[PDB]
Amino acid sequence: IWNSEKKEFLGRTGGSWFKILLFYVIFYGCLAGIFIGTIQVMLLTISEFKPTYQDRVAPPGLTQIPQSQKTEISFRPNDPQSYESYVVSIVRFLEKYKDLAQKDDMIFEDCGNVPSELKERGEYNNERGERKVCRFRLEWLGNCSGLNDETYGYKDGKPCVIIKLNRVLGFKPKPPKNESLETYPVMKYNPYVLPVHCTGKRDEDKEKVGTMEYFGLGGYPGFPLQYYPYYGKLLQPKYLQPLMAVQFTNLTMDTEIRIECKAYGENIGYSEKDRFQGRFDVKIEVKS
Amino acid sequence: DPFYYDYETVRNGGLIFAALAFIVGLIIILSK
Amino acid sequence: KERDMDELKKEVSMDDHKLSLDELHRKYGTDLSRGLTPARAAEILARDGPNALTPPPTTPEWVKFCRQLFGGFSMLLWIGAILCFLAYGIQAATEEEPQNDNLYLGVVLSAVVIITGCFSYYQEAKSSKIMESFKNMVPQQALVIRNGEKMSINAEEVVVGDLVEVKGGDRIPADLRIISANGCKVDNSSLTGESEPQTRSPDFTNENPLETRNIAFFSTNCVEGTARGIVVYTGDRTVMGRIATLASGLEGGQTPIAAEIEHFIHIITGVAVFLGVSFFILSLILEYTWLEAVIFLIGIIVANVPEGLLATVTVCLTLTAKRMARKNCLVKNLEAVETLGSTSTICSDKTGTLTQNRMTVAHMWSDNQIHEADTTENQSGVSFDKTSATWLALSRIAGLCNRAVFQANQENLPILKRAVAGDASESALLKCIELCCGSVKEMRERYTKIVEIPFNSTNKYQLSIHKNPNTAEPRHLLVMKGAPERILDRCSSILIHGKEQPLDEELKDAFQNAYLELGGLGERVLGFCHLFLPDEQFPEGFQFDTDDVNFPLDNLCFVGLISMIDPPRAAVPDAVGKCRSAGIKVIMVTGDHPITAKAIAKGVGIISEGNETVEDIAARLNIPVSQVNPRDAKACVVHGSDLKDMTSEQLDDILKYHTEIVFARTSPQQKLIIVEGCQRQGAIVAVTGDGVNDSPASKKADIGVAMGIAGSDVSKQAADMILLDDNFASIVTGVEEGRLIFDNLKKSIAYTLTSNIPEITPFLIFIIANIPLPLGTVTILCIDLGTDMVPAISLAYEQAESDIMKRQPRNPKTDKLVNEQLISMAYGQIGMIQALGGFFTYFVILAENGFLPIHLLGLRVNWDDRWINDVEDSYGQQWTYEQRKIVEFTCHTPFFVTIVVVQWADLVICKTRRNSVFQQGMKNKILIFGLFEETALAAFLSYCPGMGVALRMYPLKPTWWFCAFPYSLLIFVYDEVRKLIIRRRPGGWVEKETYY
Ligand SMILES: CC(C)CCC[C@@H](C)[C@H]1CC[C@H]2[C@@H]3CC=C4C[C@@H](O)CC[C@]4(C)[C@H]3CC[C@]12C
Ligand SMILES: C[C@]12CC[C@H](O)C[C@H]1CC[C@@H]1[C@@H]2CC[C@]2(C)[C@@H](c3ccc(=O)oc3)CC[C@]12O
Ligand SMILES: *[C@@H]1O[C@H](CO)[C@@H](O)[C@H](O)[C@H]1NC(C)=O
Ligand SMILES: [K+]
Ligand SMILES: [K+]
Ligand SMILES: [K+]
Ligand SMILES: [Mg+2]
C-alpha cells in the first residue's frame, strides 16, 4: 500500500489524470470514427442485390429436416418422448410450407404439378419489382408430413427424413446429361429435375439393410428446375426452396446402419473433407 | 460461371512475388 | 558458518613478521642455516596440505544448462506454457479442438524457452571455452634447504617453516619471513600494488606485514638478487590465497538488465492478469460458465505474453557481444554487455591497469637544466640535445653500474617492449641507454668490471670500478649511484659541460630543489656520480678489494639526477576524458604510495588541473592541515592508514563531498569496502584492475573488468568482463555499447508489444460480440514467432539517435526499460490502430463474401457448430460447415497479413524514439531486409500450396492485401507528428506522456 495515495497524487500519479483521460477519450473517439468510416465505404462497395463473391458455396450442400447432434437419429417407436425433438424440428421446418401460409397471389405464383424448365425472372436489378415465388405444397411429400394425413408419427414405425438443397443465389442446377454414368434406379426425368439417391456405405462393403421410397415433385425423386434460380432475400423473401422426403421403410431395428445421400448433376460436386457438400450422411437406429 | 474463381493465377502471382521480394532483400543485405 | 568465514576474511591481516631469528626458529622448530630434516618436511607436508591454492570451489557441471532455462523471463514463458496445458486439461471436459490450439501453443512456448536456453548457454559456453584456452600453468620448483643440502623440489612439496633460497627470476613459492638477503628486490606489483620493486631485507621495517621488508609473498617474483627465508605460510594460508578464497566467496549482485527485465515482467504480468481477471468477471457476467470463463482467463493472460521477445532479446544481447568479441573485449556473461552504460562510477586500480606498470625514465638533470626524455612507447615524442659531454658521462655511469642485461631472445624486438633480466630501475636505465646513447653491451665491456658492490639495502649505494678505454688518460674509473641525499652526502666536485667544479650551496640547493621538484612530481629520483682514481696512488696492477675500503668514498664528482616512473597505457587519459565527459564518476583505488598515485591521477584526468586537496591549499596557505575547511577541497587523497579507522558515515561524507577521488596504500579488503561504499549510495559501480588485489572488488562490483594479459588469474576469474588486448579505451566503447542497446532494446520491446493488441482483440470481442473468430492460434504464432522476428532483431542494428556519450548515466530508479509510457504507446495508441485495421479486413472479407457485419453478431454459436450446414448469411444463402469455416480461415490469413502490413509502419516508427524517420534515415539494412522478408514470407504462408490443409491458411484475393494499408499509413503519420511535437516542444505534455 504505497502508490494508491501519495502527496499530491492518486495511484499512481494523479494530478494530471484529467489530461490523459480526456486525450484517450478524444483519440479513441477518432479511432472509432475512422474505423466506422472505412467500414462505411466498404459497405458502399457492397452490392445491395448479389454478394461480390459466391465461390466458397460453389458445390452446394445437402441438408436435412431433423438436423441431429451428429448426423444421428436414435429413437424408440413406442415412446412419444423419444421422437419428440426430431418431429418438432419437422413441424417448425414445414410450418412455412402450409397451404394457408402462402395465400397471396401477389407474391406467390402457382407453378407446375410437374417438374419444369428453370424460371428466369428478368435480371437481378430492382428495375423489375419484387419477384414472385413458386409455391411448394406439402402434399408433394406423401406419407411424409402428409399434410394432416398421417404419418403422423412422421415415421413413428419406420424412419423418414427430408432432403433439401442449399440456397445459392443465381444457382441454376444442371442435372446429369441424358448420357448418365451409373446413376442408380432413377426415373427418366433427367431433363427437368436434379436427382438424389441413397446407399448404405459409400464405395465400400456396406451393412446396407433397407428399402426406401422417395417423395419429390410429380413423383420423381428430386428438385424441379422451376424453383431456380433463387433470387435472394431482398428480391424473393418468402421463397420456398424445393424439398424431397426420403422414407426408409424396411430396416433392421436394434442395429445402427449408416446412410449416404447424393445429388447428381453437372452443377453438383462432392468433397471428401466436406461430407455435407454435394452429399449427405445419416446414422439411424430405431431401437425397441 | 460466377462460381469459379481462379486461385491458381493468384497463387502463382503471390509466389512469384515472394520469390522476388526475398531475393531482393538478399540483394539489400549484401551491399558489396 | 561461511558467513563468519567471510567476516574474518574481509579483515586485513596480521603477522609474526617482527621477531628475532632466535624466536622465529623457536616457534617454528627449525635450524636457520640447515632448515629442517627431510623427515620433518615429509611429516609437515602430510600434516596440513601441499603448497598450492585449492582449485576453484566452483566447476559447476554442464547441468548448469538448466540455469539458462529459468532466469526470470523463461519463467514467464514456462508459467505461460503451464497455463496452456492447464486450459487444455480443462478443455478435456468435452470433445474439443485444442489438439490444434492449446496443446500446440503450450508445446510451442516450451520450445521457445528451451531453444533460447540452448542458444545463450551455447554462446556463454563459447566464452568459457576461450577463457580456459588462455590458461597456461607452467610448474615452478622451489629451491629449499633441508638437512643442510640445497634441494630444488616441487613447490607443492614445500611446507611451513623450512628454509628457502630465491634468486633473480625465481617466483616466490610461499609466504616467507626473510632471515638473510643480498641485493634482493622483489616485485610486489600484482599483490600489494607497489609499482617500483620493493627491496627485501631481513630487518623489521613497517608495522604492516605487506609493506614491511622482511616478508616475501606467494606469487610475487624476485626481480633480482638472492635471499633466504623460513616459510611462514603455505597453500591457501598465504596472502594471495586468502585474497583468492575471499574472491570465490563473493556475489555479483543483480545485473541492472536483470532488474529491468524483471520490472518489465511485472508490467506484462500486471497487465495480463488484469485483463484476464477483469474479463473472467465480465465473461461470467454475461453467460459463460466457470469452466469456459476460466478458459478465457487463461487464454487472455497467455495471449498477453510475448514468446518472441525472449528469443529476440537473447539475440540482441548476443549481437552486441559479437561486436565486443570482435573488438577483443570478451564478456563472460551475456547480460553484462549492458552494465557499462548504466555505470555512474568506476573504481580503477592504478598499477598494471591505468599504467603500463613498466618503469621508464622520465626526466634527467644535466648541466643545471632538467631535460625530458621521450617516455612514449612508439617513440613519436621529442629527444632533447644529446650532444653535451655531461650527458655522455652520465649515460656511461648509468650503463656501467647495471646488473640488468638484455636476455638471449631480444634483438628484433623494439628496445622498449623487449624483455630484460634484472631490476626495474636497471631495466629502465639499460633500455634508455641502449636507445639514446647506442648499444650498452659495447660500452659495458669496454670498461672491464673489477670488483662491484651490489646495492646495500642501507644507504642504497651501488658502485663498481673499471679500467679506462680513453687513449689520453689511463686512470681508474669508479662509478656509483644511489639516494640523492646520500649521494649529496658523499661527494665534493660536480661536472658541468665536461669540466669539474666544487659544490657551492647555491647550486647545491639548486640540485636539492630540483630533486624535490622531480621527486614531488611523483617520479622517484636516483642520483648519479663518478670519480677517476689517482692512478699514482692506485697503479694499473693494484688490486682493490671489497674486503674493506680501498677507495675514497668522499670528495667524489656528482654528475646528475635521473628520475623515473611507470607511465599510463597510451589511450588511458583520453579514455578517462571520455568517461568524465559521459558523467561517470572516476575514482582511483590503489595499494601504491600516494606520492605517485596523486601525480598519476592528476595526469590521466582523475584529478583535473585546477583542483586541490586540503593539503595543497594548506601548502599554498602555509598553515596546519587541520586549519583548512575540507568542504572547500574538491579533490582528495585518502591514505590507507585512515581508511581502517574510518566508519561508514565518514566514508559516505568523503564520497559525497569530493568530486575527484583517490585512495592509496589500500588493501584489497579496503577496496571491496570502497566498492560496497559506492554501492550503498545506490549507484552502479564498475571496477577495472590488474592483479590479485583487485579480485574481491571486481567480483563484488555490478560488473568487473579485468585486463587479459597483464592481469592475474584470480582477478580474471572474479571479473565479468575481460579485455584481451588490454586496451583501456575499450572501456569507453563498453559504456558506449551498454548505453546504446538499452534504447534499442526498448525499441525492440515496444515493437513486439505493439503486435499484442491486434493479436489479442480477436479473442476478446469474440467472447463479447459473439462473432465468428477473426484471428486464430496458428496465424498469431505466424506473427509472433514467424514474421515480427526479423524486424525486431533488425531494431538492434539501429544507430544512435543523438550523441549518447553527452548524457549522464540513467537513473535506475526513475529511468526504466519498460515503463508506463511505453505500454501507454504499444497497447494504448498504435496497437489499437493495428487491431482496427485487422477488424476492417475481417469485415471487408466477410461482407464481400455475403455475411454483412450487422448480421455477423451472435453468429459464433451457430457458426462454430459443426452440424448446422444450413446457415443463413445476409443474402439468404446457405453454408455448410467447411464452406463457412474456410471463409473463416481465409479470414484468419488476411488478418495475419494485416498484422504484417501494420507492423511495417510500426517497425519504421519504433526505429526512432525521438528524431523523425527522415532524420535517422532508412540506413539500417537489416531493417530493410526485415521488411522484404517479413512480407515475402507472409505472402508465402497465404499463397503456398497445401497451406490451407497444413496451416489452415488459404490464399487471398489480392484486394485483401490493400485493406490494411490506410491504417499503417495512419500509424506512420501519427507517430511522425508525435515525434515532431516532442522535438519542437520538449516541455512537454507529449513528452511526459508518450516518450519512452
Ligand atoms: C511499405 C509498403 C508500401 C511496401 C509495398 C509492397 C506492396 C505494394 C506489395 C507487398 C505485398 C504485395 C502482394 C503479395 C501478394 C500478391 C498476389 C498477387 O497475385 C497479386 C498481387 C499481390 C496482392 C501483391 C501486391 C503488391 C504487395 C501488396
Ligand atoms: C482454443 C480457444 C479456446 C477458447 C475459445 O473456445 C476460443 C478458441 C480459439 C482461440 C484460442 C482459444 C484458446 C486460447 C488461445 C490460444 C489464446 C492465445 C492466443 C495467442 C497467444 O499467443 O496465446 C494465447 C487466446 C485465444 C486462443 O487463440
Ligand atoms: C403410405 O402409408 C399407407 C398406410 O400407412 C400405405 O398403404 C402406403 O403404401 C404408403 N405409401 C407410401 C408411398 O409410403
Ligand atoms: K502472445
Ligand atoms: K562479479
Ligand atoms: K507480441
Ligand atoms: Mg595494479
Side-chain angles (χ1 to χ4, degrees), chain C residues 252 698-699 701 718 720:
Chain C
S698 62
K699 181 62 176 303
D720 321 87

PDB file of all heavy atoms in Angstrom, chain C residues 252 698-699 701 718 720, ligand 5:
ATOM      1  N   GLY C 252      27.945 -11.474  -7.220  1.00  0.00           N
ATOM      2  CA  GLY C 252      27.984 -10.444  -8.253  1.00  0.00           C
ATOM      3  C   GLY C 252      26.770  -9.527  -8.340  1.00  0.00           C
ATOM      4  O   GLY C 252      26.590  -8.810  -9.330  1.00  0.00           O
ATOM      5  N   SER C 698      36.436  -6.346  -7.998  1.00  0.00           N
ATOM      6  CA  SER C 698      35.890  -6.597  -9.333  1.00  0.00           C
ATOM      7  C   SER C 698      34.890  -7.751  -9.304  1.00  0.00           C
ATOM      8  O   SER C 698      34.083  -7.911 -10.221  1.00  0.00           O
ATOM      9  CB  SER C 698      37.002  -6.842 -10.369  1.00  0.00           C
ATOM     10  OG  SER C 698      37.779  -7.990 -10.071  1.00  0.00           O
ATOM     11  N   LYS C 699      34.958  -8.563  -8.255  1.00  0.00           N
ATOM     12  CA  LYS C 699      33.935  -9.567  -8.021  1.00  0.00           C
ATOM     13  C   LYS C 699      32.646  -8.902  -7.544  1.00  0.00           C
ATOM     14  O   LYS C 699      31.591  -9.080  -8.151  1.00  0.00           O
ATOM     15  CB  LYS C 699      34.412 -10.601  -7.008  1.00  0.00           C
ATOM     16  CG  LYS C 699      33.405 -11.700  -6.720  1.00  0.00           C
ATOM     17  CD  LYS C 699      33.089 -12.529  -7.959  1.00  0.00           C
ATOM     18  CE  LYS C 699      32.151 -13.684  -7.632  1.00  0.00           C
ATOM     19  NZ  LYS C 699      32.703 -14.586  -6.574  1.00  0.00           N
ATOM     20  N   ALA C 701      31.619  -5.806  -7.559  1.00  0.00           N
ATOM     21  CA  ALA C 701      31.068  -4.779  -8.424  1.00  0.00           C
ATOM     22  C   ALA C 701      30.016  -5.373  -9.333  1.00  0.00           C
ATOM     23  O   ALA C 701      30.138  -6.526  -9.754  1.00  0.00           O
ATOM     24  CB  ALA C 701      32.165  -4.140  -9.243  1.00  0.00           C
ATOM     25  N   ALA C 718      37.336 -13.608 -11.211  1.00  0.00           N
ATOM     26  CA  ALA C 718      36.366 -12.840 -10.431  1.00  0.00           C
ATOM     27  C   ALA C 718      35.685 -11.747 -11.257  1.00  0.00           C
ATOM     28  O   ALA C 718      34.734 -11.107 -10.802  1.00  0.00           O
ATOM     29  CB  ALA C 718      37.041 -12.232  -9.205  1.00  0.00           C
ATOM     30  N   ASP C 720      33.660 -10.127 -14.591  1.00  0.00           N
ATOM     31  CA  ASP C 720      32.585 -10.483 -15.515  1.00  0.00           C
ATOM     32  C   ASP C 720      32.910 -10.038 -16.940  1.00  0.00           C
ATOM     33  O   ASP C 720      32.137 -10.284 -17.872  1.00  0.00           O
ATOM     34  CB  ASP C 720      31.251  -9.880 -15.061  1.00  0.00           C
ATOM     35  CG  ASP C 720      31.069  -9.933 -13.557  1.00  0.00           C
ATOM     36  OD1 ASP C 720      31.529  -8.987 -12.877  1.00  0.00           O
ATOM     37  OD2 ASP C 720      30.478 -10.918 -13.058  1.00  0.00           O
TER      38      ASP C 720
HETATM   39  K     K D   5      31.147 -10.140 -10.471  1.00  0.00           K
END
